[PDB]
Write an enzyme that holds these catalytic residues in place. Structure first.
Site, PDB file in Angstrom:
ATOM      1  N   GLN B 126     -19.154 -73.824 -13.557  1.00  0.00           N
ATOM      2  CA  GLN B 126     -19.238 -73.119 -15.027  1.00  0.00           C
ATOM      3  C   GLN B 126     -17.968 -72.250 -15.408  1.00  0.00           C
ATOM      4  O   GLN B 126     -17.247 -72.241 -14.565  1.00  0.00           O
ATOM      5  CB  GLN B 126     -20.305 -72.072 -14.756  1.00  0.00           C
ATOM      6  CG  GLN B 126     -20.256 -70.906 -13.749  1.00  0.00           C
ATOM      7  CD  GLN B 126     -21.273 -70.335 -13.265  1.00  0.00           C
ATOM      8  OE1 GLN B 126     -22.336 -70.048 -13.885  1.00  0.00           O
ATOM      9  NE2 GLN B 126     -21.275 -69.929 -11.704  1.00  0.00           N
ATOM     10  N   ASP B 254     -31.846 -64.270  -8.164  1.00  0.00           N
ATOM     11  CA  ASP B 254     -30.952 -63.778  -9.312  1.00  0.00           C
ATOM     12  C   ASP B 254     -30.071 -64.738  -9.830  1.00  0.00           C
ATOM     13  O   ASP B 254     -28.919 -64.655  -9.866  1.00  0.00           O
ATOM     14  CB  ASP B 254     -29.859 -62.550  -8.621  1.00  0.00           C
ATOM     15  CG  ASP B 254     -29.290 -61.589  -9.732  1.00  0.00           C
ATOM     16  OD1 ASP B 254     -29.745 -62.037 -11.063  1.00  0.00           O
ATOM     17  OD2 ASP B 254     -28.459 -60.938  -9.525  1.00  0.00           O
ATOM     18  N   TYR B 323     -27.809 -56.528 -23.083  1.00  0.00           N
ATOM     19  CA  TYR B 323     -28.503 -57.639 -23.359  1.00  0.00           C
ATOM     20  C   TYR B 323     -28.807 -57.552 -25.053  1.00  0.00           C
ATOM     21  O   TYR B 323     -29.061 -58.740 -25.538  1.00  0.00           O
ATOM     22  CB  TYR B 323     -29.740 -57.750 -22.640  1.00  0.00           C
ATOM     23  CG  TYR B 323     -29.616 -58.439 -21.082  1.00  0.00           C
ATOM     24  CD1 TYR B 323     -28.404 -58.647 -20.421  1.00  0.00           C
ATOM     25  CD2 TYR B 323     -30.976 -58.923 -20.514  1.00  0.00           C
ATOM     26  CE1 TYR B 323     -28.260 -58.848 -19.339  1.00  0.00           C
ATOM     27  CE2 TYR B 323     -30.597 -59.055 -19.488  1.00  0.00           C
ATOM     28  CZ  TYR B 323     -29.387 -59.310 -18.620  1.00  0.00           C
ATOM     29  OH  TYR B 323     -29.047 -59.998 -17.125  1.00  0.00           O
TER      30      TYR B 323
HETATM   31  C1  LIG Z   1     -24.313 -63.688 -12.066  1.00  0.00           C
HETATM   32  S1  LIG Z   1     -25.236 -63.644 -10.827  1.00  0.00           S
HETATM   33  C2  LIG Z   1     -25.890 -65.105 -11.420  1.00  0.00           C
HETATM   34  C3  LIG Z   1     -25.127 -66.148 -10.392  1.00  0.00           C
HETATM   35  O1  LIG Z   1     -26.139 -67.285  -9.927  1.00  0.00           O
HETATM   36  C4  LIG Z   1     -25.241 -68.258  -9.291  1.00  0.00           C
HETATM   37  N1  LIG Z   1     -26.121 -69.371  -9.148  1.00  0.00           N
HETATM   38  C5  LIG Z   1     -26.522 -70.317 -10.263  1.00  0.00           C
HETATM   39  N2  LIG Z   1     -27.194 -71.467  -9.504  1.00  0.00           N
HETATM   40  C6  LIG Z   1     -26.955 -71.489  -8.053  1.00  0.00           C
HETATM   41  C7  LIG Z   1     -27.341 -72.007  -7.232  1.00  0.00           C
HETATM   42  N3  LIG Z   1     -28.049 -73.261  -7.246  1.00  0.00           N
HETATM   43  N4  LIG Z   1     -27.170 -71.670  -5.706  1.00  0.00           N
HETATM   44  C8  LIG Z   1     -26.594 -70.388  -5.536  1.00  0.00           C
HETATM   45  N5  LIG Z   1     -26.060 -69.823  -6.574  1.00  0.00           N
HETATM   46  C9  LIG Z   1     -26.296 -70.058  -7.993  1.00  0.00           C
HETATM   47  C10 LIG Z   1     -24.121 -68.287 -10.294  1.00  0.00           C
HETATM   48  O2  LIG Z   1     -23.053 -68.780  -9.634  1.00  0.00           O
HETATM   49  C11 LIG Z   1     -24.123 -66.764 -10.877  1.00  0.00           C
HETATM   50  O3  LIG Z   1     -22.968 -66.168  -9.842  1.00  0.00           O
END
Ligand SMILES: CSC[C@H]1O[C@@H](n2cnc3c(N)ncnc32)[C@H](O)[C@@H]1O
Ligand SMILES: CSC[C@H]1O[C@@H](n2cnc3c(N)ncnc32)[C@H](O)[C@@H]1O
Lengths: 342, 336
Positions: B126, B254, B323
């Site tokens: 991303q 999260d 937000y």
């Molecule tokens: C900002 S805390 C949100 C987090 O979720 C993480 N994230 C998104 N998709 C995945 C996944 N498939 N596995 C692990 N972490 C993820 C993102 O890299 C981001 O740091």
């Protein structure tokens, strides 16, 4: 009245790539060329729609459309596809201009924010102020006075803070409220069994609006001006403040819940200093004054507000806290002021 | 760049145009006019300094004005308009070096008080932005979605069950968590083991530097006495934990709104796999969506009843400062 935008930030060719799309839509073109400032191309449609296409020399490309909906959505889509071939993009939500339902209420710090408003519940000019109550999906009804957002049904946090954030014991106490016609504080203070609460609100029409439309903030407290342990007076708080001082009446708590610019029928900073002097004169030596300060980013305005605290007939101390009030979209500062111990 | 707007809503077109074209001419601005049969007028004014103005006049008393500009004009318009019988929104900065406009999940245009680009890089997964807000502190923005700000302790409190849970001696799984907020707060609460599975190391390393109010020093070490961070996709990790029969007191999802893959079936998959690694008497917390996206929230509720096992749920609405919209947080657990 629907104004769409599209921004491209890059590192004559662009004009030649884009022009095509507009001819293809039957719009008429006229170009103004600038010596070293690029181009402006205006595009008028028969249906009374138009597009502006500004091309700056340093690779900044900005496109505007004004207005059938899908046509323009698709035209912006055509502009993106074409710009991909020709190679940062920004496509902000289109701004409705002149809508019957007004969604745009800039923050005190001058930021543009769109609210989730679907219904004008109440819009009346009073002798003192314009009064709107606009409905928000997430925020409930929102009271907006002279274009300044005052409170939505969601903003219990504001009331909690101006009430001293749960540190105060109101049981059997004597309270004065200045303003506060949304009924927020009065509603919450009455549940807490004070000896007596007096609220001085100059505008009957704010109460009228709120009694009918903000019941999730004021409950039923505003149905009778006179209740068990409270009274609402419809007058200017200034003369009421003088009467109370003159008769030497004092309160445990004074809560200034006026609008940001208080209403006068008698500079703005002198007025704020005046209300403070008057509030102090009716405040118990061991009592507390609470009020709304300003948004966090208006530092000059906060600073000038605190000059007034230093300009009063008596010495005072104060604390500040920053509070997130749901419908405000800017963090807010609340003051607690007290008389300096002799 | 700077794009100003002035709107007049009223109850005659040619008279207005005529009244107005003086101010612009008074500035040296050249004019072209486009006349429509029963559609009103378009006047365009040009200044050699590079600025221009659009004056659109609808035949039913809608007068719209635009200007850019790499003010007095706008003032001078409002004055004349009063004679001839108003919305003047803050100008939008277009293509600024510092981007301040970060629209809400439900699609509203909000402007933030951003005054610095702290970090902006693309990872393999991303785009990662850290932008500074005067009131919120640094804000983490992932693929243009505002994820968390240094001010957003409320998000973290909510996603940990709003103070209802006792974490002591408990075994916790976190999915995502790259900003380090939950991690920093859970470790404070004498847990037995917190495991956080974040796929994008680069989010940890930007936050480590730039969001210490949210993460403290917890992202300075990826192992501690009571925690560990795994830098991989939570998917293979969730499957592996099922295979080993590992089960947790709490699972905290999260993730980014759109979880990362190498729509609704995916969210379902994550729910399924988290449920497999959830103790019978445990709880799963997650962020849902903004209160306004009711289809989205309903579509998500639909998936809660499409898992291998029956589950129950509750939700709460929370105010997260940066937000600029209210947010729903879910709590899910296995039917008794
Ligand atoms: C900002 S805390 C949100 C987090 O979720 C993480 N994230 C998104 N998709 C995945 C996944 N498939 N596995 C692990 N972490 C993820 C993102 O890299 C981001 O740091
Ligand atoms: C909505 S809470 C703000 C209230 O303060 C009220 N207000 C403003 N100025 C004065 C004043 N001088 N005396 C009493 N109330 C006031 C406004 O009419 C409004 O209802």
């Amino acid at each position: 009245s629907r104004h769409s935008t599209l921004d491209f930030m890059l590192g004559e060719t662009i004009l030649k790539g884009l022009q095509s799309i507009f001819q293809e839509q039957g719009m008429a073109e006229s170009v103004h060329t600038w010596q070293d400032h690029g181009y402006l191309a205006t595009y008028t449609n028969k249906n009374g729609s138009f597009a502006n296409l500004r091309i700056y020399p340093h690779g900044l490309v900005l496109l505007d459309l004004q207005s059938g909906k899908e046509e323009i959505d698709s035209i912006l889509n055509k502009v993106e596809e074409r710009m991909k071939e020709l190679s940062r993009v920004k496509r902000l939500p289109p701004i409705v201009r002149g809508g019957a339902i007004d969604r745009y209420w800039p923050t005190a710090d001058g930021r543009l924010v769109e609210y989730d408003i679907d219904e004008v519940v109440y819009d009346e000019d009073s002798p003192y102020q314009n009064i709107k109550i606009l409905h928000s999906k997430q925020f409930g009804n929102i009271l907006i006075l002279s274009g300044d957002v005052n409170l939505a049904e969601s903003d219990l946090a504001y009331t909690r803070a101006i009430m001293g954030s749960g540190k105060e014991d109101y049981t059997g106490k004597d309270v004065l409220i200045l303003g506060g016609g949304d009924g927020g504080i009065l509603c919450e203070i009455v549940k807490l069994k004070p000896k007596m609460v007096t609220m001085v609100e100059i505008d009957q029409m704010v109460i009228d609006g709120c009694k009918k439309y903000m019941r999730k903030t004021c409950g039923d407290v505003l149905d009778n001006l006179k209740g068990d342990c409270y009274q609402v007076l419809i007058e200017d708080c200034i003369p009421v403040l003088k009467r109370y001082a003159k008769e030497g009446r004092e309160f445990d708590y004074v809560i200034n819940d006026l609008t940001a610019v208080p209403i006068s029928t008698s500079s703005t900073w002198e007025f704020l200093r005046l209300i403070l002097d008057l509030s102090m004169k009716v405040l118990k030596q061991d009592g507390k004054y609470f009020t709304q300060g300003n948004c966090v980013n208006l530092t000059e305005a906060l600073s000038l507000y605190e000059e007034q605290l230093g300009r009063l007939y008596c010495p005072v101390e104060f604390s500040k806290e920053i509070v997130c009030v749901p419908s405000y979209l800017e963090l807010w500062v609340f003051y607690t002021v007290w008389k300096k111990a002799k």
